[PDB]
Amino acid sequence: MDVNPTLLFLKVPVQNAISTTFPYTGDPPYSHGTGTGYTMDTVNRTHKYSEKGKWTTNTETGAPQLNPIDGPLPEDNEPSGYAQTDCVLEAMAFLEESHPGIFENSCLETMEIVQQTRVDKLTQGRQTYDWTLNRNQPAATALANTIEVFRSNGLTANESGRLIDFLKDVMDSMDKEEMEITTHKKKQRLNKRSYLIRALTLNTMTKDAERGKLKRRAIATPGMQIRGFVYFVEALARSICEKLEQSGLPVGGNEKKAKLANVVRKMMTNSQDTELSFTITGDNTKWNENQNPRMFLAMITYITRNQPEWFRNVLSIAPIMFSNKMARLGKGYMFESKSMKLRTQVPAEMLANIDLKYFNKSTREKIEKIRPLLIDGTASLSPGMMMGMFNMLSTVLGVSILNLGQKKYTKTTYWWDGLQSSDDFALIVNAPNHEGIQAGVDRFYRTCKLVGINMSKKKSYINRTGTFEFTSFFYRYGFVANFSMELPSFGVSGINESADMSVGVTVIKNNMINNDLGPATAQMALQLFIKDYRYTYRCHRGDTQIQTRRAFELKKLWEQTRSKAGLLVSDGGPNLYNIRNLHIPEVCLKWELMDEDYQGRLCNPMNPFVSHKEISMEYDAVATTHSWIPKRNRSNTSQRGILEDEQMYQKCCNLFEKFFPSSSYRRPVGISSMVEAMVSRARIDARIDFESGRIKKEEFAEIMKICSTIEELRRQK
Amino acid sequence: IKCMKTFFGWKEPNIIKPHEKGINPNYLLTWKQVLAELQDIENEEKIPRTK
RNA sequence: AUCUAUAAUAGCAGAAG
RNA sequence: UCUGCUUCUGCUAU
RNA sequence: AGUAGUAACAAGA
Ligand SMILES: Nc1ccn([C@@H]2O[C@H](COP(=O)(O)CP(=O)(O)OP(=O)(O)O)[C@@H](O)[C@H]2O)c(=O)n1
Ligand SMILES: [Mg+2]
Ligand SMILES: [Mg+2]
Fold first, then answer.
1. DSSP codes of every residue in A547-602
2. In the 8-state DSSP scheme, what is residue B22?
3. Are A429 and A437 in contact (CB under 8 A)?
4. Any idea of the CA torsion for A261, A467, A399, A443, to the nearest 10 degrees?
5. For the purposes of burial, counting CB atoms within 10 Å of the CB of A425, is it exposed (0-12), middle (13-18) or buried (19 or more)?
6. How wide is the angle at C-alpha B39 spanned by C-alphas B38 and B44, nearest 5°?
7. Near ion ligand 3, which residues have CB within 5 Å?
8. Cα–chain center distance at A573
9. A639 touches strand D (CB under 7 A)
């Protein structure tokens, strides 16, 4: 017998065993070299889908920009970026007509959002392009560098702390004759065009650890001048998506499954009995490369009708900046000579003035096709969205096309509705016969073509209503469990012993709750997690023979302890977990069983493995000694000048927390400097203390004198 | 070392199916070196955690 | 009965597009 | 010159 | 050589 696992589908429906088809036990594919190839190929595809558009030269950056809007209607079924503005405006108008007041209410909530949001929001980002260094940096570091450069250039509206004031600072920065960068101290001066190109740049990197793809692709990260505007636009689009029944966003998880099930259920209820009902499991092809920023500007302009003009402007800036964006090419390439046995790095900035003899066929073609767009090591990319930068606005566009499917708009016997999550979509078509179904599908496809949406024909299929797939959720008369997708969440997390126990047990319990993890498999998952935990942390049961550096101390503690069942697993104790007590932490689970001296040692108030805060008297520690801190190795470049800046930053922040007790519980607000706030707090505290009677004459005088000394030092350095 | 001692029947190693793109004498010498260093740190019976 | 929300600390990890 | 955006979920508290 | 797969590793300073 030849074993064929796929033959199991001959009896078990594919949905009820979909977990088999997800091979998430092996490592995911990574990229190894540069991402310049994928970046250039993305730019060339974007300009190929819009090649019949109009070419112009940007008077501000000098970049060739392609405009495919209102271009010739497509003649074939290849992806097209030729969205018609009148069709997009009609889709918006009919979405507002079908849901009266959606855009007005969304604009009110977004006005509140825009007026209250702080600049600190921008620090909630991951790796960000930093134009001051022309490199990727943490979002908070990039924002701090931007604020420092803006301040040294006389731009200080961001001192208000509001995001919109920082956006005004960005707007004013885009009008300066020259930008001063002060490194460490080399004083560089960018001119208007160079600073402008750096401000409209999105750094490009290759996406790593991605399942389901044979070939790698490029992702983009914008700078700080783009992120605030994109945040405001995405907030407006999220407010809109929240009010739409077809939107699969921003709902996620169990709430998303419930919404999808209820909406599909209502759709099947609305469909009359004599009607034929079909469902398209549909993907859209080249979604981000055919989403035009000009159509996003049209959508925002229609959505913000009759709003204050400042609001329309601040919402219009993101599509404008994305219409004039530049894509940084990346790291370049690497060249090898076998005969000379040497290798060298060729930067991307010299890919326009390099000889094409060095490259293979396809890379030479890429460079030849992309050379007219190269400026300062970036490529002009007017069309496209550059990989999920306006997820919610493109969701709104897709939902508008879905909304165009009611019988009041089709004016025929067929109609359609469905679900839209950015690019993914489930389309339910109803019609009195099969010809009507075909006509409705053709009309939906062509209407999508009219707005720059291209249904992937090779990835989409259609069947009688009742089963479909939407955003990796498989629906067979109801959504099925897919446990494999949550498989990489099982294991030792690497935080510390306590946190790893908590995470392992909690993951097992939540997988029992959400992903149909059965009780026997849950017990076996518990056993496997305890094995992996004991291996990782060298904390095998005291009464064992495994030889490790920790085993002697564990044997001593084991033989020392009367009640062994109270010892934590990290202390070589037994595993008392079962299905009953997964929701209970480990220290609480066996608190009754602990020996008194072991319990008073594990939870000692003067625990030396956790940090202690001053009130040299300190607060008592509560955590156990298993909550230690892992050494983080961060030691070979020239970027070692920031280690001292960060150390002094930390010193200042600890002093501030000594003056402001709630600063680390909630984010502090204030336009005053740190010294001013701290001195005023010290003064008012000394006053209400001398008054209430905790300090005397002389201590109050001394505090007031030190405050006056600090204030004359801040005025007189 | 103990599991190897359970086997009697060692011969002089010779190449039976060569690696057509490699240098096979290097593989023969690598196996001989593994045997020699095992005999070395066994003759010592001061067997470290790593050799 | 409602409850992302008559709501907003932050970081990390998993998944999805 | 190298883990982006968005959404959800879980854990933790420099 | 090998890993690997559209570009890299097979140390670097
Ligand atoms: N990591 C990710 C994955 C997806 N996305 C967003 O989801 C879209 C569809 O991805 P997708 O992966 O479905 C496109 P694929 O099906 O591979 O190819 P095709 O375009 O030829 O059809 C992208 O264009 C981005 O907007 C993202 O922002 N980050
Ligand atoms: Mg789909
Ligand atoms: Mg896809």
1. --TTHHHHHHHHHH-S-GGGS-GGGT------STTTTS-HHHHTSTTS-HHHHHHH
2. S
3. yes
4. -150
5. buried
6. 100
7. A 283
8. 40
9. no
